[PDB]
Amino acid sequence: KVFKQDRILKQCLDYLVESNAAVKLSATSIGAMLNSLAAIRFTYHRSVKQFMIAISTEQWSEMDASPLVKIVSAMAKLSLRLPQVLVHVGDRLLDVYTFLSPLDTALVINSLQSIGYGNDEVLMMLMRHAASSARRWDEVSLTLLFGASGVHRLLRNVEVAAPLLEQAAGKTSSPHLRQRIAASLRRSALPRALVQSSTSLLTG
């Protein structure tokens, strides 16, 4: 209903935190609640921060891929930056990255960019996995990936950015996204020849 009464949800979250119920809830339930809170731009971030902190490392250790990506996406859309939640997220990603769908990979990459994630190994290996499975990427997934804030940071190697660029040239058909990708290629650290060829393909 896009209903915005944040006092009611604040009372509900206070009851959730006080009852120590965040240590027994399911991963998909946590993701659904966080996504619902983020979909309406919840105001009181202190309650959400306490609720996310209260959950234990046991839950973080064996979360499935999709609830985990939902949780990190809801964290990113709520402008939450937590130093100790992100290390748990990173080790869980290290464990279960191979099962991510392409749209999950794009969501993870752009959400981690949106929160200014400082780790580079996890980002680099996620980008490598995305490059390996480039032949299956849809249109919305490419928009989500190449629409990330610091996308040019991730376009480090030619191997990790060649199939993604050719797939974007083949599939993406929006002038603004192509211009943004060309600008990111210009600001990237790729070899000059590949940048020139990709810019030629995308624009013109």
């Binding site: 399911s26 998909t28 339930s29 659904a32 619902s36 999709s66």
Partner: peptide
Amino acid sequence: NPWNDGDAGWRGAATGARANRGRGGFRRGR
């Protein structure tokens, strides 16, 4: 299978395991 006799059982029960395998957002609400 006739022995099931129209009883889905645990595979079609309401348990948390079966309720934790879908991504609908629980928006409309049962």
